Symmetry: C2
Subunit: 246 residues, 2 copies
């Protein structure tokens, strides 16, 4: 049993749901999940700001559980900091654990997404997101700093975090179908930790004929690579079954 | 046996072609050949920089022709002036040019190799020496900050002529090192520029400062080795270049 530490916005309900679910289809490894929450309700530069300020407390709480990896699941709070903020966040967290002899590895949803995209050899990218436009635009800037080209994106503009957790798959699929994907390497069908997408990932891949992924499947990828386990997890798109194919 | 390295250099750049073979012919397990094409530039300003960069595609066909095993785009400041993550885009563009027309040569840029080498060292807190004008020096800093490094101090020698840069004494570079505070620093980038001479200074720097030092040239040397899947074991220049021994 591998203990995974989750740092999540208090109103987030989708990471604690999707991570266990797909990681339970792993061929030989078994996992357990352990959360600490940072208070946020409205996804705004101010909502993000007050949340992010709680990190120090959360890291301390979750390290008490001695997990093998900690996933800092606050994706948009990282990216609103702009170019390479996931490095300085992951670093800050590592530094903090180093103060107390924790052995935990660190990954973030922002890092993982970059990792999944690079694992795909993706250059041209499209994304679907529930954010307001100004925020959607920040996610896009951040990705372009990582070398990707955002050809097309969609922002459903749903600011209340609770409501984001309730976006139906059909709203998400429709936005995805409105996209021009002809010149696109990968579709990030959920660029948000909160917006559900899991039951969609595999089907979208089949329909669109290009790799599909989300913050969650990419988190699951990062996690698996960090614990040296086979990425051979079925039904969550090609990203997650790289070692079954090569 | 002999591994064909490609160099795409600024026309007035002199150091890359001196240092890259200097250190790389010090490998006990492989020998190398160097070959280049030139993008004209005389003034290291946003103007000349852009007009140099516009020459990339011609340069890259020219060198493909020789069929290098790796093509080093040899510009650092010319890459970093174009914004966070520019090296990815430039490498991608070159790479795509090559495949479009046969060549399988691997692609690396100094800017890239710099980060790769900082990262292989496990550096977070970095100090640096540059020849540049401050406005470009700050751009190089911003670029490295977006790559997740903390630039805790830097010197900027402020020498706009690329020829002046190359004629740059070890009196000056070594002096700047000693200038910077390094009591929190993990790695020295003793020269951020592929034009500014640094090498004789470098292996000593480490033994002097107790810390991993490097430069674009050495960092590009490291990156080349890794790309060619050769052991990194090159003398006289930092653990970075001798970390497999
Ligand atoms: Ca990067």
């Amino acid at each position: 049993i591998r203990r995974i530490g989750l740092v999540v916005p208090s109103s987030n309900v989708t990471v604690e749901t999707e991570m266990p679910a797909l990681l339970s289809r792993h061929p030989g490894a078994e996992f357990s999940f352990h959360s600490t929450r940072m208070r946020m309700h409205t996804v705004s530069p101010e909502g993000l700001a007050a949340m992010n300020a709680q990190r120090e407390r959360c890291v301390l709480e979750i390290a008490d559980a001695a997990p093998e990896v900690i996933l800092y699941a606050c994706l948009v709070a990282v990216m609103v900091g702009g170019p390479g903020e996931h490095h300085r966040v992951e670093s800050a967290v590592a530094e903090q654990l180093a103060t107390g002899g924790s052995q935990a590895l660190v990954r973030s949803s922002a890092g993982a997404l970059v990792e999944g995209l690079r694992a795909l050899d993706a250059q041209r990218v499209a994304l679907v997101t529930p954010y307001m436009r100004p925020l959607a635009e920040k996610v896009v800037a951040y990705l372009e700093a990582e070398g990707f080209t955002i050809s097309d994106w969609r922002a459903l503009e749903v600011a209340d975090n609770t409501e984001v957790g309730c976006i139906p798959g059909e709203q998400v699929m429709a936005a995805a179908r409105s996209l021009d994907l002809s010149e696109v390497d990968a579709l990030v069908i959920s660029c948000c930790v909160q917006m559900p997408s899991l039951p969609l990932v595999e089907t979208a891949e089949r329909e669109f004929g290009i790799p599909v992924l989300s913050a969650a499947t990419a988190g699951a990828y990062s996690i698996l690579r960090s614990l040296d386990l086979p990425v051979a997890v079925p039904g969550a798109g090609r990203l997650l079954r790289q070692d079954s194919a090569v």
